[PDB]
Design a protein around this ligand. Structure first.
Ligand code: TLW
Ligand code: TLW
Lengths: 58, 58
């Protein structure tokens, strides 16, 4: 060890960060009167309805 | 002792400190409905279940 033959110095680093996300929301707060389309074998009713409103410009 | 023949002075030190540690934790807070795969001899049930959710983009 007379010289710096044994003198040693070293550093090392490794950092990793990963992220991920997702969202999906929906809301509906109306009331619509529909009409029966047909009666199924079990008695369930197929209902279809439509409502058109022309407030102004569309 | 006329000269510094007996005059003496010396110092010495040796300090060592080592440390080590480790941690490992995990948590899981879900609910999943599984289905029986087979019935063992002692009556134990082999249960396997799977649930796939596509929120959006994955
Ligand atoms: O004993 C040896 O082998 C050495 C001592 C150091 O001086 C070393 O650096 C080398 C030098 O390269 C000679 O020129 O020689
Ligand atoms: O009695 C001796 O042997 C000594 C006395 C000191 O003077 C010592 O240092 C030595 C010196 O080297 C002579 O030149 O001689």
């Amino acid at each position: 060890f007379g010289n710096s033959r044994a003198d040693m110095e070293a550093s090392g680093g490794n950092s990793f960060n990963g992220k991920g996300g997702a969202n999906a929301s929906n809301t509906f707060s109306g009331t619509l009167t529909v009409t029966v389309d047909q009666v199924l074998a079990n008695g369930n009713l197929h209902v279809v309805g439509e409502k058109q409103i022309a407030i102004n410009q569309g």
